[PDB]
Design a protein around this nucleic acid. Structure first.
Ligand SMILES: Nc1ccn([C@H]2C[C@H](O)[C@@H](COP(=O)(O)OP(=O)(O)OP(=O)(O)O)O2)c(=O)n1
Ligand SMILES: [Ca+2]
Ligand SMILES: [Ca+2]
Ligand SMILES: [Ca+2]
Length: 903
DNA sequence: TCAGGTAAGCAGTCCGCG
DNA sequence: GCGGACTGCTTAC
């Protein structure tokens, strides 16, 4: 097999590399790698190395890496550019793996672990590590085993051995319900003392050294705690055995309002799953506790126990250990679904970077571009210092707040990367500038043609057309990969809808789910078999289709993220190819493209309807347009349609056969106007929206920019079994909005769009009547909480104190003195409730850590003093009044002359 | 919230507005 | 009471 790296490090003048050799074996080597850097040289000097601008360079080979770094410094002192890859391990990988890396994941040791630490005096700080580690569960992907290290004797209590028999039993048998599928995979090791536990853990670690190290909060808690605890007990040298090269470094991670410490383990790639989740999941969660996320992702029950976690080991060690094991499994289950590890490996090996560098698109793209240029013997420029500067972005059209009955939307495929490719935007393709006219002049095609030679953007930039830049070349490769995975995603989505339809008529039979590949549209044979299946088999197939869709989503959306982040990197001061001329070229072209096509669509539809100056495009944001289809529907007549699906088909056909060709023609003209390299503005129909045929539903509404709701029947070629609400920006979509309120507001919207005013009025009346019965957590608001200290003046709100921070200070006074009470963590999230006047907390609101029950110290008082009236007005009534005013509807029935008769 | 970008909405504070 | 200036936080893209 072809060799591939696992980890790479620079330690002084040596590269330390762990790798899989040609025989499939894990090896480690130390290489005295001699790096090369570059200086510009005279034209008369014969060379094969040239910078990206075509200027000749001489290669300087250094005796070692320290010499190379010192040379860079001296070049700065002289005031001359030091060219080449300054990150020497990236150069090492480029030299050592000069081919497309094909990795075998089965050879890569992926470890995920979780530790338990009993602490009687609050949160056990990892920098201190003053409390015993009393449990470690460490899953190894190669062994497929959960290694459980269990401390039986502690200063906080001596306990009996954990029982695998009880662990396996149902909660109703007094067991822990450790999933049956992992029971036989548990290797249980009890220890009579913490020293022997940790020494064995280290010996185990040496034998089975993680390449990828993951878990939940492992980088912020588990790793630093383990390292510091071992350091405290045994000394530094023993703790450093967590590194296969015995090198570690305390790394200070800085943010806007403070800093924290992590431990860098040389020769390991830490991919903390919480951070993978935050980057790649495209959620914003009210809480990032493993419990909360596992419930959200897997629909698994909350892990229940009596009393505080500080007393769990002493009171129920059985449950304590089982829950430690389950926590490790839940991360594996989340990854089985989301597949962020697979994604990270894919990206890392493609770029030829340390796998952990996938968190940095700047590092990822620097490596991709370097490898690409190196292939042509080209030499990368030196990174430079730049001051942070604001620059303009997208255009968003101001909509007229209103109901909109029939809507067709259109969207440009991968806009910013498509602009990069079309215009040929790259550091080395800059041709010069032209004299800019107001943007409106380009939008209306009245400005003079920018260039007859170069490819242009309306920000004044011109680009070479003779050959693709490295940025267009490399962005295209990843775009093409994204397209493939999106194809799989949409097929699985369409397949899911086929199964949902079949579930209306399930067969009374006992059978199996079909063995199919959900990434491809079901054949006629498969569809016929599906119509004969039981509900049990169909539901299993639906679950599998949805899992395939999720797998495709991860793969496609994050390749989309990577390519959009290349645009983003052009506007980031730390990128080697940072250039606001290029960043603004992209965004300004986008603004023109959107408003150009708005004009073209308006012109086309005014022509086909026989009107003048009427606005068919009701809204647009960045790269999308929303087109009113009322007049199209009205031209055929609503009475001519058999059912909802009939007018959906009609609009589908109209968009594809009439509108899309018109849009294409408009963009081809724009391409010629800007003299671009390649026409790549592909705007396809996205959503078809409207009320159910014969209903009093309003179909859709806009309240303002980035705030709308649509009843969608077809999305990107997926015809839904049931209409799906597309709600953007509204309170239903905000993590700050209470859970039960999101639900209620969503039902209000559903009724507005599908059923009408009277239906909405009936639901509002009921929610207002019953909402005080809702669980307090479900009606609590949520907010991130920063700068708590800034607004804390003697435990009381300082000037301009934010409402949620006021809540935290109220909480802090109420739990004052309690060492065991849950602390609000700076930078994390809190639940927030309003309090009625005259309450014992002495203020108008209280806040507590999100994803948790408020401490029993104050729970009863919070419940008693919760201001339901304020809660309802702020979170529910005010947003609903916004929706209904925009939609021109009333959520409460107005008095009429009919009131009253009957006698 | 260490780790690509901008536009833009709403909650809330402060306080003017005769 | 509502809006403007401002901070904070959250979305859409
Ligand atoms: N996280 C994001 C999302 C969007 N944008 C920019 C780049 C996108 O090209 C443009 C439009 O965003 P879309 O959500 O419509 O995504 P794309 O057009 O890139 O991809 P596609 O529509 O094919 O899914 O906005 C961005 O810079 N970063
Ligand atoms: Ca798009
Ligand atoms: Ca059937
Ligand atoms: Ca879009």
């Amino acid at each position: 097999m072809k060799e591939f790296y696992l980890t790479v490090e620079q330690i002084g003048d040596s590269i330390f590399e762990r790798y899989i050799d040609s025989n499939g074996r894990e090896r480690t080597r130390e290489v005295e790698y001699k790096p090369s850097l570059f200086a510009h040289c005279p034209e008369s000097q014969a060379t094969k190395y040239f910078d990206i601008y075509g200027k000749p360079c001489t290669r300087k080979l250094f005796a070692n890496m320290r010499d190379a770094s010192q040379w860079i410094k001296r070049m700065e002192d002289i005031g001359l550019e030091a060219l080449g890859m300054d990150d020497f391990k990236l150069a090492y990988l480029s030299d050592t793996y000069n081919y497309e890396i094909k990795y075998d994941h089965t050879k890569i040791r992926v470890a995920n672990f979780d530790i338990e630490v009993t602490s009687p005096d609050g949160f056990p700080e990892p920098s201190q590590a003053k409390h015993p580690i009393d449990a470690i569960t460490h899953y190894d992907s190669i062994d497929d085993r959960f290694y459980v290290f269990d401390l039986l004797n502690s200063p906080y209590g001596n306990v009996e051995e954990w029982s695998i028999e009880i662990a396996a039993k149902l909660q109703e048998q007094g067991g822990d319900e450790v999933p049956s599928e992992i029971i036989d995979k548990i290797i249980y090791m009890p220890f009579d003392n913490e020293k022997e536990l940790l020494m064995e853990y280290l010996n185990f670690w040496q034998q089975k050294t993680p390449v990828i190290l993951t878990g939940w909060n492992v980088e912020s808690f588990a790793i630093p705690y383990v390292y510091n605890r071992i350091k405290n007990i045994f000394g530094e040298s023993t703790a450093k055995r967590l590194s296969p090269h015995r090198k570690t470094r305390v790394k200070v991670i800085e943010n806007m309002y403070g800093s924290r410490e992590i431990i860098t383990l040389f020769g390991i790639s830490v991919l903390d799953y919480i951070d993978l989740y935050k980057k790649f999941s495209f959620t914003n969660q009210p809480s990032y506790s493993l419990d909360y996320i596992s419930e959200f992702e897997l629909n698994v029950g909350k892990l229940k126990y009596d009393g505080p976690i500080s007393k769990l080991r002493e009171s129920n060690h059985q449950r304590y250990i089982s829950y430690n094991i389950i926590a490790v499994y839940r991360v594996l289950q989340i990854d089985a679904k989301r597949q962020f590890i697979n994604l990270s490996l894919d990206m890392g090996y493609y770029a030829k970077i340390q796998i952990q560098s996938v968190f940095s698109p700047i590092k990822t793209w620097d490596a991709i571009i370097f490898n690409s240029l190196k292939e042509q013997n080209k030499v990368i420029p030196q990174g430079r210092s730049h001051p942070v500067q604001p620059y303009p972005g997208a255009f968003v059209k101001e909509p007229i707040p209103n109901r909109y009955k029939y809507v067709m939307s259109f969207d440009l495929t991968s806009l910013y990367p498509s602009i990069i490719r079309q215009v040929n935007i790259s550091p080395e393709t800059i041709a010069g500038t032209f004299k800019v006219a107001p943007l409106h002049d380009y939008i209306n095609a009245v400005a003079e043609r920018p260039s007859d030679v170069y490819s242009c953007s309306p920000n004044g930039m011109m680009y070479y057309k003779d050959r693709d830049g490295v940025v267009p070349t490399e962005i295209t490769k990843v775009f093409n990969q994204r397209k493939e995975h999106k194809g799989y995603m949409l097929a699985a989505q369409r397949n899911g809808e086929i199964i949902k339809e079949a579930l209306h008529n399930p067969n009374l039979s006992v059978d199996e789910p079909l063995d199919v590949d959900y990434r491809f549209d079901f054949s006629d044979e498969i569809k016929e078999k599906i119509k004969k299946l039981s509900a049990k088999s169909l539901n299993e197939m639906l679950f599998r289709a949805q899992r395939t869709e999720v797998a495709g989503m991860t793969a496609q959306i994050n390749r989309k993220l990577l390519i959009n982040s290349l645009y983003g990197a052009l506007g980031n001061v730390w990128f080697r190819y940072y250039d606001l001329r290029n960043a603004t070229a992209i965004t300004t072209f986008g603004q023109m493209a959107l408003q150009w096509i708005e004009r073209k669509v308006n012109e086309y539809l005014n022509e086909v309807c026989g009107t003048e100056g009427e606005a068919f495009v009701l809204y647009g944001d960045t790269d999308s347009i929303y087109v009113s289809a009322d007049k199209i529907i009205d031209k055929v007549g609503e009475s001519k349609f058999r059912d909802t699906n009939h007018w959906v088909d009609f609009l589908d056909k109209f968009a594809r056969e009439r509108m899309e060709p018109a849009i294409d023609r408009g963009f081809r003209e724009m391409c010629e106007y800007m003299n671009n390299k390649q026409h790549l503005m592909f705007m396809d129909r996205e959503a078809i929206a409207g009320p159910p045929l014969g209903s009093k539903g309003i179909g859709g509404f806009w309240t303002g920019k980035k705030r709308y709701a649509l009843n969608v029947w077809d999305m990107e070629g997926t015809r839904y079994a049931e209409p799906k609400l597309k709600i953007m920006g509204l309170e239903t979509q905000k993590s700050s909005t209470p859970k039960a309120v999101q639900k209620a507001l969503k039902e209000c919207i559903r009724r507005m769009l599908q059923e009408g005013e009277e239906s909405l009025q009936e639901y509002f009346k009921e929610f207002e009547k019953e909402f005080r019965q809702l669980n307090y957590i479900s009606i609590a608001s949520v907010s991130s909480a920063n700068n708590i200290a800034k607004y804390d003046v003697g435990g009381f709100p300082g000037p301009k104190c934010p409402f949620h921070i006021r809540g935290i200070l109220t909480y802090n006074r109420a739990i004052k003195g309690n060492i065991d009470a849950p602390q609000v963590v700076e930078g994390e999230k809190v639940y927030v409730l309003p309090l009625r006047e005259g309450n014992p907390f002495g203020d108008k609101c209280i806040a507590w850590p999100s994803g948790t029950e408020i401490t029993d110290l104050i729970k009863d008082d919070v419940l008693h003093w919760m201001d339901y009236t304020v809660l309802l007005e702020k979170t529910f009534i005010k947003p609903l009044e916004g929706f209904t005013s925009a939609a021109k509807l009333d959520y409460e029935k107005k008095a009429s002359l009919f009131d009253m008769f009957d006698f």
